[PDB]
């Protein structure tokens, strides 16, 4: 039918509009700024409680009490200042791939290959962590989850869809819309009104949590997008892929802004995070260490090395005091 | 330094002790990943028998515990990364069907040459051998229609065999997978082909023997002998 033809010409004229909006590059504007210099962060804390591969972590809003999920069916809450374990939560399913820590600090979340998003309450009268709620609507493996508040959580799963859930009712509110590939990552805006999600079809999508469908679509990768993260101001985001490349897109331009890649790295990217000011971009790779790029000059400012296996997760605390990464050698390392 | 800090340290030590005990208890058991297309009898390979997400099976052979995980959801390229540390991959393939044999060979090639399955051994189960024998003595379906090399193939002289046509068809089907497995790998991980009927009951013994051999390989590589 002519629907394919009109969709094709519609894509063509969107591309022409994007080209018309592109009058210059970010590199030309940023070439006048002096470089940030060599950044060599030091490892201060090493957390050695897990006995299997660590798949996710999440910092707390108080810059301590980071939760981490490992393949031994364990969620561990760490006091990062003293390397003290606060809570150890056993999981019914040992195949956990994501974990989230509530901004209020009263709840944690986990999920994975069991297709269940389990929310655990941390502050109970009995003094032990119990399963507060379970969400069982997704038909694929859970890939990411993020807390909007104490009662709302947005999850991205391997059924090519993302969902928004209410904890009290236990039912999903908005099922959003599907990609054409497995959704691998999700990031929340600072104003908690929009969120970006990257899928396996080399596409990222900007969604609104209120109206409930996709506002914007971004492309430019040619492999699986594995990580995504907003800019601190919420007007930009960064994606990492299996192409050994990161792309900084711009929301208000709807056009791919910056590409970070190097010739000596060919392995995929697992975790992508920004600094507090947004000047530094932290990217975890499959070559057993982490890279620190300049978000404007697009050059390798530094390297965080010391992990003996694949770096699986990254996270920068709210005040930017330190960055904690977690790898497949059952280790979490804190750097500043 | 304070009293509350010391009590928190004591709580952390208790948590560490519990974690170490649970880790040793989990270290006792062995884990397997079950793979195979539909209409292949993958679920009925082991007679002895958490259904949310991944089907779970537990069976004991000679006081050794095996936990077999079967993922019920294609999109295999993503969640396979979680299973790079299992003891073995039990690949069950139906040999009675020749239409889907090439697809099964391509699937086995994809599993064998996976980036995260470099050091994971595969135990291959050529299921439904009796149906293969019935089809090859029927004479209506021929391997030469799909695999022309069977026209130029003969059974090896060192064979240890039923009808000789059954033996040559079985050895050709096995040799395809063996050639695929021996093309790559370079000794980091090997394959263990096994013939199996739908009513067989000694598959668990074969799995146990192959797992013991794999653990022997790991122990020898640990001591820098191989």
């Amino acid at each position, epitope marked *: 039918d002519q629907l394919r033809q009109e969709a094709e010409q519609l894509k063509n004229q969107i591309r022409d509009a994007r080209k018309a909006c592109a009058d210059a590059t970010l590199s030309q504007i940023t070439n006048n700024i002096d470089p940030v210099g060599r950044i060599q962060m030091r490892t201060r804390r090493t957390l050695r409680g897990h006995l299997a591969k660590i798949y996710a972590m999440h910092w707390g809003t108080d810059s*301590r*009490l980071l939760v981490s999920a490992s393949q031994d069916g364990k969620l561990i809450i760490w*006091d990062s200042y003293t390397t*003290n374990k*606060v*809570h150890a939560i056993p999981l019914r399913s040992s195949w956990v791939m994501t974990c989230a820590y509530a901004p209020s*600090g009263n709840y944690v979340a986990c999920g994975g290959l069991d297709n269940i998003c389990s929310i655990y309450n941390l*502050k109970t*009268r*009995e*003094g*032990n962590v119990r399963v507060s709620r379970e969400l069982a609507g997704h038909t694929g493996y859970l890939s990411c989850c993020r807390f909007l508040d104490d009662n709302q959580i947005v999850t991205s799963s391997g059924d090519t869809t993302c969902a928004l859930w209410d904890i009290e009712t236990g039912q999903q509110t908005t099922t959003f819309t599907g990609h054409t590939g497995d959704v691998m990552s999700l990031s929340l805006a600072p104003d908690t009104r929009l969120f970006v999600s990257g899928a396996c079809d080399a596409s990222a999508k900007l969604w609104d949590v209120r109206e409930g469908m996709c506002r914007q679509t971004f492309t430019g990768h040619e492999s699986d997008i594995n990580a995504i993260c907003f800019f601190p101001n919420g007007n930009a985001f960064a994606t990492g892929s299996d192409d050994a490349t990161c792309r900084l897109f711009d929301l208000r331009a709807d056009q791919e802004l910056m590409t970070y890649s190097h010739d000596n790295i060919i392995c995929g990217i697992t975790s992508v995070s920004f600094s507090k000011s947004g000047r530094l971009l932290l990217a975890g790779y499959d070559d057993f260490n982490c890279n620190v790029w300049d978000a404007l000059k697009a050059d390798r400012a530094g390297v965080l090395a010391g992990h003996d296996n694949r770096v699986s997760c990254l996270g920068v605390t709210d005040d930017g005091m330190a960055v904690a990464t977690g790898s497949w050698d059952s280790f979490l390392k804190i750097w500043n | *330094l*304070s*009293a*509350e*800090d*010391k*009590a*928190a340290v*004591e*709580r952390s030590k*208790m948590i560490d002790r519990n974690l170490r005990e649970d880790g040793e208890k989990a270290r006792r058991t062995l884990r397997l990943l079950l793979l195979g297309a539909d209409n292949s009898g993958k679920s009925t390979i082991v007679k002895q028998m958490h259904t949310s997400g991944i089907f779970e099976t537990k069976f004991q052979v000679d006081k050794v515990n095996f936990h077999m995980f079967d993922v019920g959801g294609d999109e295999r390229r993503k969640w396979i990364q979680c299973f790079n540390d299992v003891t073995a991959i039990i690949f069950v393939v139906d040999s009675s069907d020749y239409n889907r044999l090439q697809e099964a060979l391509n699937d086995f090639k994809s599993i064998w040459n996976n980036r995260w399955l470099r050091t994971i051994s595969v135990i291959l189960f050529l299921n439904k051998q009796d149906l293969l024998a019935e089809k090859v003595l029927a004479g209506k379906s021929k391997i030469e229609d799909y695999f022309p090399e069977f026209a130029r193939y003969t059974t090896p002289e060192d064979a240890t065999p039923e009808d000789p046509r059954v033996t040559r068809a079985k050895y050709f089907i096995r040799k395809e997978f063996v050639d695929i497995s021996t093309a790559s790998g370079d000794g980091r991980h090997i394959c263990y082909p096994h013939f199996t009927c739908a009513v067989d009951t000694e598959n668990a013994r074969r799995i146990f023997n192959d797992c013991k051999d794999i653990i022997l390989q790991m122990n020898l590589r640990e001591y820098n002998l191989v």
Partner: single-chain antibody
Amino acid sequence: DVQLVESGGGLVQPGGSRKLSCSASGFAFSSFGMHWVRQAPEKGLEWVAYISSGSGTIYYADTVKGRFTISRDDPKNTLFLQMTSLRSEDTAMYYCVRSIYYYGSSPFDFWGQGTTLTVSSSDIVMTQATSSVPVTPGESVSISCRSSKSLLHSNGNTYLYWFLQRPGQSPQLLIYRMSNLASGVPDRFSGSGSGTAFTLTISRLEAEDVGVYYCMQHLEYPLTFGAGTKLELK
């Protein structure tokens, strides 16, 4: 839901022996430190014994050291206090206190009913400097407390605990630091202070605010309570 029922009191001849038992229910008893706290029938509270989770740490008061023993039975959720060679000052009221310790924990939150024991015939000076305050409901009350040594620690915590005891009722935890309000306590309670001086402020007074207020320190191993300031309606 949380219940701590303790028994074993009564009349004991001097120099005798007595076992006090406490059964716990409604919470994971094996993961909690447990205290025995003694108050005289006319004086205030006085900490006696403490046993940590897993029974790896045991602390005794100096006045009862040697003749008192504390033990824990985790399968049946029970705490035991074996006392021998009782003196004349051991006639008192015994409370069993639940207390957990992690980063964001609030120790001393729950207290037991208590048992009555009757017999026949350095430490931080935690002062109150106020026997009682005559006051009417409606206004705001400030209660001061002081310590002989500065309670501020290098980690930023201060370890000051404001407790309330209603007449005829077990004490309850009001504030577990200077300002960290406890669970179930109304917002009208507040606390502040410095390394040595502390102030507890109550914005509004109802009929249930009558009782004795205690200030306790948790800086080091011996735990010393205050003299107790009594607030009553008049």
